Amino acid sequence: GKEAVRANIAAVKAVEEALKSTYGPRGMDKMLVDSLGDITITNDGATILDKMDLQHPAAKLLVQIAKGQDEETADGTKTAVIFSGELVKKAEDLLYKDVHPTIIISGYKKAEEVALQTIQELAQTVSINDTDLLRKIAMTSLSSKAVAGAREYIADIVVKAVTQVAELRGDKWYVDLDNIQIVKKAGGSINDTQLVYGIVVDKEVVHPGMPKRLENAKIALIDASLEVEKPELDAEIRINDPTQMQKFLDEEENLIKEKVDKILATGANVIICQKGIDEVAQSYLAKKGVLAVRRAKKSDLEKLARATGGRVVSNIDEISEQDLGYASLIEERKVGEDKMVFVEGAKNPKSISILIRGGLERLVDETERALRDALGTVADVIKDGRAIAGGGAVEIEIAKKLRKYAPQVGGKEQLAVEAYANALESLVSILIENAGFDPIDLLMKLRSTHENENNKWYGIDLYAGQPVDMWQKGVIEPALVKMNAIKAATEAATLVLRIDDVVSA
Amino acid sequence: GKEAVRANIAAVKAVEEALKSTYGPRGMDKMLVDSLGDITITNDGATILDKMDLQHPAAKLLVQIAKGQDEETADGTKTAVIFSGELVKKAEDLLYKDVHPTIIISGYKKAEEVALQTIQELAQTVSINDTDLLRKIAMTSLSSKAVAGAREYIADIVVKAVTQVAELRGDKWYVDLDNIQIVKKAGGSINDTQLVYGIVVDKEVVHPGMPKRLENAKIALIDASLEVEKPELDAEIRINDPTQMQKFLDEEENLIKEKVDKILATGANVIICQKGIDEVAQSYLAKKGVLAVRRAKKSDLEKLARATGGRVVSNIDEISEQDLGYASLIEERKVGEDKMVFVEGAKNPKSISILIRGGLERLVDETERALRDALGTVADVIKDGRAIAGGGAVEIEIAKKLRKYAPQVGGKEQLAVEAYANALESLVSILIENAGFDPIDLLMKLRSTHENENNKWYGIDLYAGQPVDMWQKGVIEPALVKMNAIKAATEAATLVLRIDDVVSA
């Protein structure tokens, strides 16, 4: 009976106590000091659970379901855990009062039914042209991150990037993130942030004698070395003769003009590689009038291949007119204090790039995280097409609607249902609390202003501190994330109740 | 802070825990062992708090307001204590939820207001002709007592017994219960209990050769001795002449033949007294044809006085036409092994007696107790005129209506009103508990079956375990006694919250 089941509940309740203080943007920050002295300040639900040395099986079963998803978004995760641990919490008081755990699982199951269908008969249809909407949903992702600069810049780009790549897949829109490169440089400002309609190779040209801008450049993506490897790389030479030395390294020098000539046999305007380009081979490309780039990321040859229509080639005796790329005009421009080659006017319109700049050496990294999550989120908004008002709105409803339902559902099973409703309202209470107001007072002030039907989207505006329409202040969010959180948590929750006993090894 | 308020509350719950298993029908009996080891097995609420020493003021103060009654009939006291302690209990669970007692008091007042008037606007007009109603009110009283042989007999009697005494005073019915005398003899059948239209004197006639019964007979309620008192009683004799001796004790005896002729100077037909009658004066009263009784008790000379219209005569030389009494028939009868005078058909209609018979030496005494609570109660219903459905019915309604009310009334105040409601259902849960069914199950089955107004007088059957109509199974109860309980209980409960700190001399 009561015995081991408490210890389990208790473990769950502890894990809740590790995230409680960090929910929403008035959330506090947890310090994590790494063993080699290195410091990390965070409020990320995952890390705080992932880096935690748990020894309690309950807690490990609960966080595997809570923390992780087999989805691109990393969001709803603090909700998933908080909501898990409150549902378990509120359930404990029913067992104190002697209700069978079997009932409370069925009760939470009937509540889970309704709660879920209550999101569905209420989301609003959002599709591609609802661009004046996606700008807001995006700020709702970026606003709790560290970005100090204007969010409007970043919101505007994120929208165009998703809409650029969107393509009908079975007569409904789909987007793949892989057609978008994200390049970042510290210093400068966020006003220098932009979308390039091309690909950007962050290695400059071989000599400035090469054209500054080339018209209709037939690109050559060469994975193979355009430089010598050293015959002494494995072990020391066995040549004792400088006459033999000469004729060998000459024939090796004539081998790189061969490699060059075997690619210029196809008549490319531009030649880019991921390894060196010899000092005889740089002079040789310069006298032919080609634009060459030396030692670029294997990462970017790839990014230019499926953009310009080209293929990355690892063998000169294999490059053909079929393998070259097409781009209308390739040029080299200066980004901050580094020159970089840009290859605009490529054959794929889905393929684009983003230049993030501004802020410190770690803040620019977290601006790239924020823009990555915002970009994913907006594309998920297109992939699904439902978006609801945040700030507690759909939540309060799932409670009130459930509370009216409860009377009719059954005997003991009532108390259970009524419990699921109260636990959700506990979430909005924790939220109000960390925001800086009295919970019972603000919740009541909302459940009177949320009794009539026309106040459907009413929540509590965190800074104003009083019940208003969240939708009409931009606070809108993905209806499916905040729906699978209810499924993740209620699973985890009910699983804690499912363990009768433990006999271990 | 926490200092006295935990302690006060604590003590109040403890007292509750002493009566809880003794509430209502089927309840368990508590054993009271005096300091001389004298044993009393009981279930009387009062005694159990009266004979017990409480070390806490707060407790002592709660039980005083609950237990106490300034009306002649006392009922509802186990209820008074429980509802009190359950209201204190549910308020502590509010202090936990972080509400101040100034809000719990305001909450409770608003719930108490509504609770009261909900008993007004539901009660039914029961007046003198509603005798089939008073029959119910008698049985609702006698039915949960230890004694139970022939209660229908005693039920019927109560109704007749009171209906006779009820008189219009201030343009509404009053019952002056003091005009009913209650006499008890042990042994014989319990069915032979009866109502007598007169007074009953427990003493026999002085000479059997005196009449068996006189029609339209003038009573002489004589207090003065018709027996001599000898001089050795005061002090040692000082008379040395025996002739004088003789004349003292001769004239003192001739003084009683003097008194007897000076009483019969008013034209008496029967004479009952407080002291004895001299043997010469017995033979004298016998030869006159008088009907005499000797050595009664003064307590009934007065009751038989103002029943037959006489006065109790202290001074024989003051006896007159205005001092004597009229009765339709006085006679001498035998009840079991006891020979007594009966005085049926008195001048005053109100003055009647009840004759208890049957059982053993301790049972017949508990038949007198039961009869008083039953008489009282029916007469209290005549004195008021409002009567409601018993068995939990009015209780569940004062709960339900408050629960539906709460949403609309305010913030914190909601929680108090709701709690107050939860305390009233608690009362019936205890009641249900002691019959042996599951509280939550049967409680829920009421809260679903009791929405329709055709089930207003629904309650819970404690011998068949299922919600039924109480009214139509004869469980009706006095509407003001279960209302004044509420005023006590709410007062008392709020009185315990009202104490902040305490100083001891």
Ligand SMILES: Nc1ncnc2c1ncn2[C@@H]1O[C@H](COP(=O)(O)OP(=O)(O)OP(=O)(O)O)[C@@H](O)[C@H]1O
């Ligand atoms: N101005 C605001 N007023 C009220 N509520 C707000 C406001 N801005 C944000 N919110 C709410 O705060 C909630 C909490 O967000 P958060 O993203 O921290 O929860 P989470 O998704 O569980 O955590 P994570 O995103 O790290 O997984 C949002 O879902 C949103 O509805």
Ligand SMILES: Nc1ncnc2c1ncn2[C@@H]1O[C@H](COP(=O)(O)OP(=O)(O)OP(=O)(O)O)[C@@H](O)[C@H]1O
């Ligand atoms: N036959 C019955 N069926 C249902 N309930 C009954 C029956 N007889 C009495 N009751 C209920 O029992 C309840 C409480 O009983 P009880 O009289 O012991 O408590 P109390 O009146 O608070 O204590 P006390 O009478 O000693 O002051 C009453 O309100 C009455 O409705």
Ligand SMILES: [Mg+2]
């Ligand atoms: Mg989130």
Ligand SMILES: [Mg+2]
């Ligand atoms: Mg009673």
